[PDB]
Swiss-Prot record:
PANTHER family: SERINE PROTEASE. The gene is eta. The active site is at H72 (charge relay system), D120 (charge relay system), S195 (charge relay system). Belongs to the peptidase S1B family. It holds the Pfam family Trypsin_2. Its cofactor is Ca(2+). One of its GO terms (molecular function) is toxin activity. Its EC number is 3.4.21.-. It is an enzyme of class 3 (hydrolase). This is Exfoliative toxin A. The keyword Calcium applies. Has serine protease-like properties and binds to the skin protein profilaggrin. Cleaves substrates after acidic residues. Exfoliative toxins cause impetigous diseases commonly referred as staphylococcal scalded skin syndrome (SSSS).
Amino acid sequence: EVSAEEIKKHEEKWNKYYGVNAFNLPKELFSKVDEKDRQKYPYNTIGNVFVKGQTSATGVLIGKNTVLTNRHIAKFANGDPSKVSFRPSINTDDNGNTETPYGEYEVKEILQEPFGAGVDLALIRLKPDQNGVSLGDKISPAKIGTSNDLKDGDKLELIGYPFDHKVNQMHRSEIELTTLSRGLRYYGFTVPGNSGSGIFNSNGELVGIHSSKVSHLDREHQINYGVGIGNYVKRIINEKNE
């Protein structure tokens, strides 16, 4: 139970992201990442996780051949690697020209829920290209930080592929942390394709992975939910990363 003043204020904030048309959102809160920035860190660690005829979401290169995304996204492949593809820094302009600067990678193995079924993260291991060159040799993986020092009110950058808005176009979203007692919760503009989007701090460190929207305050309102790279998650990543 929370005061009626909260639901009012929550609705106030929420609405500044979802009350106006996506295209009408202020650039500071949501914007397309241009070509120049796409070639730089941390943007180039972001890729599109494509599951043939199932979904198109986001993933973060955290290892030489490893991509961190959501367990719910990975489930769409039913343990079958041939069904998933990873396209780092893919871009399709409004005129259908698609470019994949580092190529497209095949998956050799899906670790569906290495952190437990109630933690929405999965690891995707990639094959190197046909020359045996790993994606992580072409691009430096994201630096992994920690979510331990984050606090209510913090502002972070969520980077991903908002499919439902624009196909294969990397966008950044400013997010605002809120009641962190109930997991990584935040205000910000996202759509289903942002699932698996990286959340970075001012130091360029990966501190969380976007998951979805969950009920908040009461059963009738929403907030974005993400999985923070906490002590436990960090440990499993150090153990299985590659």
